[PDB]
């Protein structure tokens with residue numbers, strides 16, 4: 104008899120604008136407004152170590168604004184042709200929204216509007232539609248995902264020593280992470296992570312090492328070797344009163360595409376020590392015997408599918424092996440990997456692909472093949488906490504969102520604390536059992 | 543005939559929780575829920591270089607959690623006594639809401655509930671009320687401030703080299719800042735700050751210096767003296783195509799309390815070189831003749847009222863002199879300062895005093911005396927961007943909210959972008975003329 108405003112879910116206005124990311128570079132934000140008054144807003148993150156097969160981040164290249172990194176062309180796409188094509192379409196039909204954008208762009212890699220344009224609208228639409236449906240974003244995402252009412256709290260992997268392209272130090276390995284597997288709630292995980300991070304500062308200070316931070320909030324000391332990162336972490340974990348293995352495990356992201364040069368893996372920080380893919384796999388293996396490293400991401404170059412097959416055959420039964428730049432959140436590429444016995448896990452970045460629909464497709468493909476899905480930030484973030492809702496609503500099981508410093512990382516942890524407080528035992532924290540090779 | 547939902551602004555629920563700040567330490571967030579379905583939420587920031595007369599940041603001291611930095615006691619005050627005293631009160635009456643809190647706590651420095659509890663609720667209530675009134679927080683703030691419809695976009699001072707308690711380096715001066723006074727909009731100011739900030743990384747990398755960042759998102763290199771920070775900034779400004787003076791001016795915050803020891807100022811990064819008040823003031827003057835430094839905060843110790851009287855007599859006609867730990871956003875203390883010819887500017891930190899009402903009273907007191915008010919962050923921040931709306935709604939004219947890196951800082955710039963986009967020329971960007979002495 105009366106039609107509620109929630110039913111009035113057609114898009115009436117889309118506003119694109121240029122905001123600033125956690126490195127000080129421009130990025131795209133969009134707002135999507137519905138007839139019933141609902142609004143969602145979101146922003147595109149931005150990577151530094153970008154895989155060569157990522158959907159295109161469109162920047163302006165005008166050296167007179169922001170050293171060429173303006174995003175006015177992307178924002179113009181949001182405000183002009185994207186908006187014109189979505190006005191009057193039902194925001195609750197996520198897959199329908201995304202399809203109109205992807206089709207209008209018409210390109211493989213989203214190079215006409217930019218993946219930055221399309222993603223911001225895609226995520227803002229989802230938020231809008233959640234609110235039109237009368238629910239929080241994680242609940243709407245589980246509905247979009249085909250898994251209604253099913254949630255979990257992700258096991259975070261927390262990058263507390265930063266290197267490679269994220270920092271100005273002599274460390275080649277991009278990320279050294281802790282995982283609070285012994286925690287019973289993500290709130291407890293967050294606190295354990297904070298404690299270890301603070302004890303790590305004390306460890307580093309006593310050795311005369313720098314405690315300023317890199318792009319993801321972890322320390323960026325100069326170390327005598329990439330392995331030494333592991334020793335200092337171990338030290339800190341023990342100083343915080345925790346058992347390495349039992350309470351806390353380790354993970355790494357090598358981002359090895361960043362140090363592959365003329366067909367070899369070259370550790371610049373270790374006097375340009377060069378390795379073939381087999382030898383580099385053996386280097387990684389020796390680390391996994393000395394420390395409880397249970398996950399390794401991008402252990403080899405994006406293009407070295409032979410090397411990945413090998414690595415997966417030698418390490419994959421025991422260790423989670425995460426493809427990041429290997430897969431670029433891309434069903435086309437993940438499928439071929441799954442067929443070739445390559446990796447057993449994927450890092451999910453909605454901006455590697457450019458829409459929430461395509462991102463949920465990549466999570467489905469991984470889950471169906473027994474691969475784990477790790478929901479990830481980019482090194483260039485904003486105060487946006489969307490990935491926390493994505494992790495819970497897809498019950499992905501794991502999240503990669505930074506050190507326990509910088510609100511560009513800590514805003515996602517706080518969103519996790521909020522979600523867990525509303526859901527309680529409806530969103531279990533499953534611990535080490537979420538990680539490939541431990542269940 | 544029909545009463546709208548916006549009229550149902552009575553408080554129905556208040557929720558407190560422990561969340562995490564930009565250094566990884568706990569802080570208090572509160573949500574305030576109104577009958578008509580309106581919700582506000584906010585969090586308390588937290589300083590590292592905290593004034594000895596700041597209202598109390600209540601922490602737990604339970605060494606088994608967060609190294610003793612838990613805020614469970616504060617959160618309990620929000621969830622029990624505070625909530626129970628405000629449920630049923632009209633959120634639109636900010637002054638009454640803050641009164642009930644202040645009075646129930648009943649101590650001078652909010653040491654029963656903590657200023658962290660009271661502030662979180664205070665701000666969350668304002669958010670709720672704005673929503674109930676159908677308006678952005680900056681517009682509700684202007685009505686609460688007794689200055690309806692009157693706005694400006696603040697001129698930011700951007701701390702791009704970090705020292706003292708904000709960074710693990712050999713720099714004594716806590717902050718070295720740029721201000722993009724030549725900009726016509728706060729959006730252009732933010733662009734100019736980004737550009738200079740990125741040219742600064744290049745200048746420091748050319749010199750072999752570290753480009754990791756301190757707590758406020760500025761670089762934290764080791765330097766050969768404190769004044770070297772100004773030289774590298776000036777290099778950066780020129781490399782960015784800008785003119786120091788005309789486009790960009792400089793500002794400092796010495797946080798000199800942090801290097802005051804047995805009655806002298808001691809520059810530990812320059813071989814423990816000791817200064818009396820007078821000779822530290824002369825050190826500062828010398829920097830003001832070499833570089834276009836137009837504002838200096840906390841040039842002396844919070845307790846050295848005699849020295850500030852001097853510094854103001856000597857430097858105050860031509861430079862802005864901002865009291866921070868000197869005044870602790872506290873009208874009782876600013877009043878005595880204004881009476882004794884001390885400083886000509888105040889740094890406004892809502893958590894130094896613990897309520898939005900007392901913060902607006904400090905802003906009023908300053909403007910009535912012709913002092914400027916600089917709206918400030920703390921070094922421990924959250925994604926909260928309230929200080930952007932506070933700066934605009936009180937047309938304070940200046941803001942101190944970080945380097946152009948770390949979302950704990952950039953969230954405030956983004957919110958200033960959004961505000962200016964909505965207000966256009968109803969919030970002018972007044973540039974250089976906002977600064978005391980210009």
Ligand SMILES: O=C(O)[C@@H](CO)OP(=O)(O)O
Pocket residue numbers: 149150151152153277278319356358427450479480481482483
């Ligand atoms: O390589 C990565 O996994 C990410 C996230 O840490 O960094 P970037 O956004 O720089 O690709």
Ligand SMILES: O=C(O)[C@@H](CO)OP(=O)(O)O
Pocket residue numbers: 588589590591592717758795797866889918919920921922
């Ligand atoms: O001293 C200051 O002005 C502030 C803001 O930079 O730092 P803290 O919050 O550590 O007091």
Ligand SMILES: [Mg+2]
Pocket residue numbers: 150151152153154358428
């Ligand atoms: Mg990368």
Ligand SMILES: [Mg+2]
Pocket residue numbers: 152356357358359400401427428
């Ligand atoms: Mg990688």
Ligand SMILES: [Mg+2]
Pocket residue numbers: 589590591592593797
């Ligand atoms: Mg201070």
Ligand SMILES: [Mg+2]
Pocket residue numbers: 591795796797798839840866867
């Ligand atoms: Mg100070």
